[PDB]
From a paper:
Here it is shown which structural adaptations were introduced by directed evolution experiments that changed the catalytic properties of the [name] ([name]) (S)-[name] [EC 1.1.1.77]. This enzyme, referred to as [name], is also known as an Fe2+, NAD+-dependent group-III [name] de­hydrogenase [name] is involved in the catabolism of rare sugars in [name].
Also, [name] structures were obtained of the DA1472 variant in the presence of the bulky substrate analog, compound 7, cocrystallized in the presence of either NAD+ or NADH. The mode of binding of the substrate analog is the same in both structures [name] well defined by the electron density map. The observed mode of binding of compound 7 is possible because of the [name] [name] [name] amino acid changes of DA1472.
Numbering used by the authors:
A (entry chain BBB), B (entry chain AAA): 3 to 385
């Protein structure tokens, strides 16, 4: 028997944030804490929301202390600001980093036992729902607005840990490509292939079933078709990417992912590597590694990614789907090897250990050994 | 900007009702009123739930006063039983009739200004969320467990009225084919083609967009592929039907349907016709009427319904999709003509008026006139 956690309410398309003032008035909320980062404030992205809230007469304080790969320190700082703001709800504005930080604050606020943060790892045994969250992504992205997962960095144990908890699901998501247009091309490409990694990994994960298969294959189709266009700055392509990344979240949240995310998390913890860039470099190599344990699913991936698989053997089709991902990586300007983003050969043993102990690795369709992950890192490292 | 209302939590597959006791304990609810009908009690379908609740020690009273095409009288009776039960939440067990009745009780309970019931018609301006509903369907399917819509019969004005309200969305849906297996073949076929009508109408509705298109086309594929098998009594086909009917609900709830539902509602009000039988007889005739206003969408329908469209013109493909639905109706034992279920030529003028004033008619891709609907009824009436 399979469980689906989704957003009760979500708005999609350009101008979707225009619905926020109305959703807040419907629920009777009094004051927001906006969780965001400094970049989004001084790009005027936060202003696009706070201007509408001022016009609607809705009170808000702001915490913009979030950094890429949010730390336990960041979570504690924000939790402190939330308590002193007298706010009764949360508005996450940004990529995975502010949205994951927002979820941590929301959970600990109503489950104060978890103030240390690192005790949220795995299936968080929280008694109480999160402080209500309204989620507004600015990356096409991590689907943080719809997933029941969030990833915090333990600076002292030098690892990223996943917390999975139905209590952290946002009440409303606003998926507005107007909020995402300010992404630099490199960021559109990184977060774009993070979305594709969620969809491919989710499609082949051990817990996969009919409904998540249907969602993931549609998300791969939307992302493969739109990402080149979005990175180039096309407006309609940006709107497609915004939807594609969300539809991936509806799936992988509820069944899981695999060794790509398992091997990407240690890279973030060790080097502060952008999550999408780590994922994008590993994805094709892990896809090749997983090929023989995926049944017919690489034929479907290859097809919706624009490959003619009419009269291909299964191994030829599996190779074609891997090659489709290498090509898309090349076109959107992602460095092809881990060496290129500052990963060090010396660390691979330690990284392979952390990858094997990651929550995401358990979902991988092929049972990965330390020997295998060490070899994968080395394959992804070279040149 | 498009809004999606979905279930925050849902369980799918045989044994899914096994998750109900746990969901109730998580939320801290004290006593249920089970809304159902007499048939489901004395078929032991309700027992499959209440036995698990007794084992978990969870209190419940029962209202089984629901009849096909539930009336304002039924709603008032149930609202009375709810008030005298001291219950704090609702469990809907049955098809569209109990589930729609449950939503009416839940809404009026917390929005008591709507005690007349008929003032819920259209976009219900309710201030308060429904009394929490846990939804367990026993038909395949009206998708009442996931839609924000419900249909009540006004005995005094002899018309069915649709109420659309995000506040009525159930907290949890349990989609268990074990609960649906006792459906007689005729009921599997009726509710089966009601699910197909939701998917086809939803696919071509005026408000249709990318995400609902993706959901509806997958639901048509699941239903076309499984309905003959389910009517024959196949267990796995019943499980597919259970998912297919739900996936249709995820779409049509959020964008609407068309003139099939518009023309089916008056038939229920006048003759107490089973909703699915009325829908199934009208669907192919309304599909023909709509054909020129649907873009490429009948090519997609035809394809996922098992028709080879590789080298077909658009008009030939549109004709093939209409013929696919006539054939599926023939195979599951739905008669071709409205005369066959007791519709009277004398009433067509009155029925055409009621159809034009139905909420669902506004979604129809071709703007329907009274003259047109009169002609459609006559076309659907006899050969
Ligand atoms: N619209 C935007 N315009 C400009 N800069 C932006 C925009 N959105 C985000 N940025 C900037 O991009 C950088 C990356 O932001 P993140 O929130 O880290 O982006 P994302 O890739 O969505 O998040 C990754 C995070 O999600 C988790 O799942 C994962 O483990 C990782 O911690 C930051 O400097 C942020 O301010
Ligand atoms: N598993 C089952 N086994 C046997 N009989 C069943 C089962 N489930 C339902 N029934 C019986 O089928 C008959 C029809 O039940 P409904 O609830 O009316 O069926 P459904 O088609 O799901 O609902 C139609 C209603 O919903 C609205 O969408 C529509 O406008 C109409 O009011 C009733 O006698 C009911 O007891
Ligand atoms: C285990 O599944 C997950 C793995 C990673 C994340 C964070 C992310 N968006 O990449 C969320 C998850 O869902 C619970
Ligand atoms: C207007 O849309 C609807 C019309 C009819 C129903 C009930 C049904 N299942 O036929 C639900 C709806 O969604 C809000
Ligand atoms: Fe990710
Ligand atoms: Fe219906």
């Amino acid at each position: 028997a399979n469980r689906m956690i989704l957003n009760e309410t979500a708005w999609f398309g350009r101008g979707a944030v225009g619905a926020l003032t109305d959703e807040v008035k419907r629920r009777g909320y009094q004051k927001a804490l906006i969780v965001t980062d400094k970049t989004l404030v001084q790009c005027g992205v936060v202003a696009k929301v706070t201007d509408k809230m001022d016009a609607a007469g809705l009170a808000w304080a702001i915490y913009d202390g979030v950094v890429p790969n949010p730390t336990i320190t960041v979570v504690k700082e924000g939790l402190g600001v939330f308590q002193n703001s007298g706010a009764d709800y949360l508005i996450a504005i940004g990529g995975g980093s502010p949205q994951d930080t927002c979820k941590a604050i929301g959970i600990i606020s109503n489950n104060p036992e978890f103030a240390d943060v690192r005790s949220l790892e795995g299936l968080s045994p929280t008694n109480k729902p999160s402080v209500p969250i309204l989620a507004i992504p600015t990356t096409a992205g991590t689907a943080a607005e719809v997933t029941i997962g969030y990833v915090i960095t333990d600076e002292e144990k030098r690892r990223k840990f996943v917390c999975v908890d139905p209590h952290d699901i946002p009440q409303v998501a606003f998926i507005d490509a107007d909020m995402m247009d300010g992404m630099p091309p490199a960021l559109k490409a990184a977060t774009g292939v993070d979305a594709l990694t969620h969809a491919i990994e989710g499609y082949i994960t051990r817990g996969a079933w009919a409904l998540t298969d249907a969602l993931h294959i549609k998300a791969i189709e939307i992302i493969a078709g739109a990402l080149r266009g979005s990175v180039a700055g096309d407006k309609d392509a940006g709107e497609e990417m915004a939807l594609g990344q969300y539809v991936a979240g509806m799936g992988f949240s509820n069944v899981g992912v695999g060794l790509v995310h398992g091997m990407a998390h240690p890279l973030g913890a060790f080097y502060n590597t952008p999550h999408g860039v780590a994922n994008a470099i590993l994805l094709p190599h892990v896809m090749r590694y997983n090929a023989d344990f995926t049944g017919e699913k690489y034929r479907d991936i290859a097809r919706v990614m624009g490959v003619k698989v009419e009269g291909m053997s299964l191994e030829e089709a599996r190779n074609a789907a891997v090659e489709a991902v290498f090509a898309l990586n090349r076109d959107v300007g992602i460095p092809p090897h881990l060496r290129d983003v500052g990963v060090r050969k010396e660390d691979i043993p330690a990284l392979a250990q952390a990858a094997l102990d990651d929550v995401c690795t358990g979902g991988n369709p092929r049972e990965a050994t330390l020997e295998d992950i060490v070899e994968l890192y080395h394959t992804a490292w070279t040149s």
